[PDB]
Amino acid sequence: GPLGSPEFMEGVLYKWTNYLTGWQPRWFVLDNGILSYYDSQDDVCKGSKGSIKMAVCEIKVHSADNTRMELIIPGEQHFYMKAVNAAERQRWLVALGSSKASLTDTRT
Fold first, then answer.
1. What residues make up the domain containing 8?
2. Which value, in Å, is the radius of gyration of the alpha carbons in the chain?
3. Do 52 and 79 contact (CB within 8 A), yes or no?
4. What is the dihedral of CA 75, 76, 82, 88, to 10 degrees?
5. Sign of the CA dihedral 37, 39, 45, 50?
6. Where along the sequence do coiled-coil regions lie?
7. Deepest of 51, 55, 66, 82, by most Cβ within 10 A of its Cβ?
């Protein structure tokens, strides 16, 4: 994953809401082992209202290189994330996937 270059990642992901609404892009940034969500980029500066703690949350990454990844945090969870394309997904995989590999606390 992150090698030498600063381990920072930012962008949006597909988030499922309802069948009527379809899909809604939401803003996510990976920093310091925490994956935080915001309403927009400007909203980031206001201060996070909520975040996903990667050290306690699994980013589900297997092998198939494509946009589909899953975030599971026991209690809240049910976060499905999908990038623009598999390449974009790989960017998230660089920051997030490194967290998966030998992560803390009781997993699975």
1. 1-108
2. 13
3. yes
4. -80
5. negative
6. none
7. 82
